[PDB]
């Protein structure tokens, strides 16, 4: 009645995870893996590829170590769906997240993606 619900909610799943686990001391990246486990086609090749760049920047902005596994699972599901081993960043980024990444973690991620 009168108040027709007009609010963009839960569109950005990644945003919700990062925001929720940030605003709450949860900081449990494992939930992200639980999400990325769900075999669903989230995006298209170019969509996910570009969103790689977008998320690259947005992730760098938070410089958060405790979301590493989150960002990995996000980027891995994105490029896995995109079907590409490549990686690219925004003009502003000028910084490889991989350099901060624990290579030990990235091994398993690529182990899956490259398959």
From TrEMBL:
Source superkingdom: Bacteria
Record's protein name: Uncharacterized protein
Organism: Neisseria gonorrhoeae (strain NCCP11945)
